[PDB]
Amino acid sequence: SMAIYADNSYSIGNTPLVRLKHFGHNGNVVVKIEGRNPSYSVKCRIGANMVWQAEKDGTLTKGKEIVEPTSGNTGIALAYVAAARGYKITLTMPETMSLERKRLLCGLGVNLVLTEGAKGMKGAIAKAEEIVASDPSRYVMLKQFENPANPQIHRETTGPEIWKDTDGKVDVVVAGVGTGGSITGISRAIKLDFGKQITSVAVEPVESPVISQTLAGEEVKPGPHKIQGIGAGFIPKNLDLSIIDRVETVDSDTALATARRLMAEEGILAGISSGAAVAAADRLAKLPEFADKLIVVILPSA
């Protein structure tokens, strides 16, 4: 009867589906704008749900401080959820952060612990572990890449929203893989709860195709790229390889060019990883196999 959220963490999701006019075949590419969220990214859903589970798990209690190594959207998602629910939070990340990002996080009240940019995510992960080890009783690390609350919340929210908003006629889901939680949880929701055998498509960088190489039985050779949000260089444990039907690779130039076309030709604001996801879905959408299929693309961030 009333729709008043008790705090900002509960306002996650219910993101919109917008049909693309200049991609795909006869309107078969439909995007889900996860930028329309608290903290302007997909990551608000797992920010909230890992905090919510840790409270019901008993692993995060009043006075306990959150510690998480993240240079990306997960830090902002956890920061605002922590402020909204009264938790202390430490974020470790390398010193390559945008300077507006630094001011944003400390504006949110984050205890920012910076590590050497040359040590990358590995240095920040190690410092986060060190901080927790220093006093395990005082801290909790949510571990976005392994925590099941990550894919669980997309099974409970992102998936059903796609099911509901397409009146069950979604046929393909195209999602870049960072933690894998999005593609994992959406697929479980639709293939298992809704029982429809859609084509689940993971997207990764041409530069670091560790999923493609793993599935083909080849040596994995991760490498650097500029598609921020995906291509971690390993198979994250929240990516369930068994529900992946296909892997598309997009290089950084194409992702950036596609993002620019999204803004100039569709009037949609989204990050480079959204461009990657749309490049992959557009490539598929002009295949006879998918000519008749409704493709839903995850746009992870603003």
Binding site: S71, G72, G120, T179, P222, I230, G231, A232, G233
Partner: peptide
């Protein structure tokens, strides 16, 4: 090694 990413920004997630």
């Amino acid at each position: 090694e990413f920004s997630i």
